[PDB]
Amino acid sequence: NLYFQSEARARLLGTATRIFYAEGIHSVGIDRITAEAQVTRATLYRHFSGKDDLILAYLDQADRGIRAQVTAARGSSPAADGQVRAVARSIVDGIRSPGFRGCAFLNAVAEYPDPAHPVHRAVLAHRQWFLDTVTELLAQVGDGDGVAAGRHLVMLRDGAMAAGCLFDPELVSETFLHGVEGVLRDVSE
Amino acid sequence: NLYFQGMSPSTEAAARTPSEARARLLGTATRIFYAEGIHSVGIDRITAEAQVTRATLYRHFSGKDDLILAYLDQADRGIRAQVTAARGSSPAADGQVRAVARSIVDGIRSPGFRGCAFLNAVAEYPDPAHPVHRAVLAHRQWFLDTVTELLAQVGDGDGVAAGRHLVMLRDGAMAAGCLFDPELVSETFLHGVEGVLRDVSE
Numbered sequence: 001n002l003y004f005q006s007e008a009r010a011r012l013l014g015t016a017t018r019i020f021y022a023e024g025i026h027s028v029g030i031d032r033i034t035a036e037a038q039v040t041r042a043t044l045y046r047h048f049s050g051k052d053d054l055i056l057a058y059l060d061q062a063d064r065g066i067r068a069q070v071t072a073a074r075g076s077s078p079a080a081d082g083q084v085r086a087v088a089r090s091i092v093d094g095i096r097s098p099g100f101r102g103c104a105f106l107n108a109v110a111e112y113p114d115p116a117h118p119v120h121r122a123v124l125a126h127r128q129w130f131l132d133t134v135t136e137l138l139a140q141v142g143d144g145d146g147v148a149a150g151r152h153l154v155m156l157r158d159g160a161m162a163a164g165c166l167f168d169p170e171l172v173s174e175t176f177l178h179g180v181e182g183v184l185r186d187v188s189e
Numbered sequence: 190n191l192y193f194q195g196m197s198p199s200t201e202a203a204a205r206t207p208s209e210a211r212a213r214l215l216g217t218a219t220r221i222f223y224a225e226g227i228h229s230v231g232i233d234r235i236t237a238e239a240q241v242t243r244a245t246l247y248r249h250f251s252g253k254d255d256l257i258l259a260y261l262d263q264a265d266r267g268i269r270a271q272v273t274a275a276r277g278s279s280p281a282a283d284g285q286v287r288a289v290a291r292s293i294v295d296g297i298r299s300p301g302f303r304g305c306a307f308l309n310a311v312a313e314y315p316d317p318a319h320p321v322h323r324a325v326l327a328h329r330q331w332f333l334d335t336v337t338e339l340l341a342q343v344g345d346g347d348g349v350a351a352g353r354h355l356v357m358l359r360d361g362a363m364a365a366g367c368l369f370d371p372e373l374v375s376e377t378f379l380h381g382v383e384g385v386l387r388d389v390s391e
């Protein structure tokens with residue numbers, strides 16, 4: 001459904017995911033989450049240690065889903081450049097999907113700016129994994145180490161995810177794919 | 190000073206704002222909302238740190254939303270001034286793009302950088318009907334129009350694709366500038382801008 005995608009626990013996690021992703025975090029109270037999840041507050045605390053734990057579980061779901069999708073993209077082509085293209089296509093398919101609302105991690109970090117906050121740490125860990133992954137792919141496309149190119153590809157991805165819910169998603173996706181082709185060309189020379 | 194707080198717009202704002210109480214309110218809201226976020230920061234925090242009563246707040250602003258919009262308006266004015274000054278600093282269309290890019294980098298590298306004020310606000314105000322969302326889109330469209338018009342003057346084409354590309358790099362740079370080594374972010378961004386300039390020139 002969304003780009004990264006006990007019955008009571010599943011309803012809680014699914015509801016928190018949907019609402020936090022679409023609407024934001026601080027503005028969304030556990031009373032609304034429990035009401036929409038059709039559980040009580042006591043049931044929420046039976047599964048999660050509080051709102052913070054629930055937020056982290058939401059982000060963990062997103063992390064796991066994205067990792068699976070990026071891994072599947074890497075599995076979809078035997079060629080390093082084909083794998084980069086497949087990752088880029090996955091990103092676009094998310095951007096153009098109904099209910100796209102930007103990067104879950106960039107949206108969370110806007111609200112959790114203290115670097116040592118667990119939400120902030122989760123954001124940085126996910127981002128570093130993604131940077132490492134695309135850097136490694138690009139290192140296999142050309143003779144160089146892919147380090148500068150990886151940063152470049154991440155910059156394009158960050159701008160695409162940010163603008164995809166603020167500007168025509170078809171146009172954002174077109175610009176992003178052209179940018180990716182340019183990075184692939186750049187490293188091949 | 191925050192990245193959007195230049196001498197010209199700040200001085201002109203001061204001339205428009207003879208109330209010291211109003212100035213403390215706006216300065217306090219700007220500092221805290223920018224650094225920390227918006228929903229998590231109550232008007233009770235702003236009045237305390239602005240050293241005014243709640244009744245003084247409401248004498249100057251109609252509520253929290255009015256104050257948020259005033260903060261974003263000052264950021265908008267400050268960035269417009271900086272970008273327009275950057276365009277004034279070079280007579281050449283490509284030099285103007287490079288100057289705008291240097292202005293962006295200067296902000297990213299500045300102490301207290303905490304990302305794009307507008308991207309951070311819209312993360313918290315996703316409802317397109319909300320005045321904060323509308324303000325963010327208005328600022329962004331002005332910026333896209335501005336760089337598209339510059340790029341249209343660098344090469345023979347209309348600069349439309351190039352302008353969207355430059356905005357994508359800018360958005361990525363602002364988003365990552367507080368999440369990654371700002372010097373490395375700046376280097377990547379400037380290299381990207383050079384690539385866009387080359388692309389439009391053929």
Ligand SMILES: [Cl-]
Nearest residue numbers: 251252254255
């Ligand atoms: Cl109001």
Ligand SMILES: [Cl-]
Nearest residue numbers: 269270273274
């Ligand atoms: Cl002017």
Ligand SMILES: [Cl-]
Nearest residue numbers: 271272292293
């Ligand atoms: Cl600027």
Ligand code: NA
Nearest residue numbers: 112113114117
């Ligand atoms: Na925080």
Ligand code: NA
Nearest residue numbers: 368369370371
């Ligand atoms: Na870093």
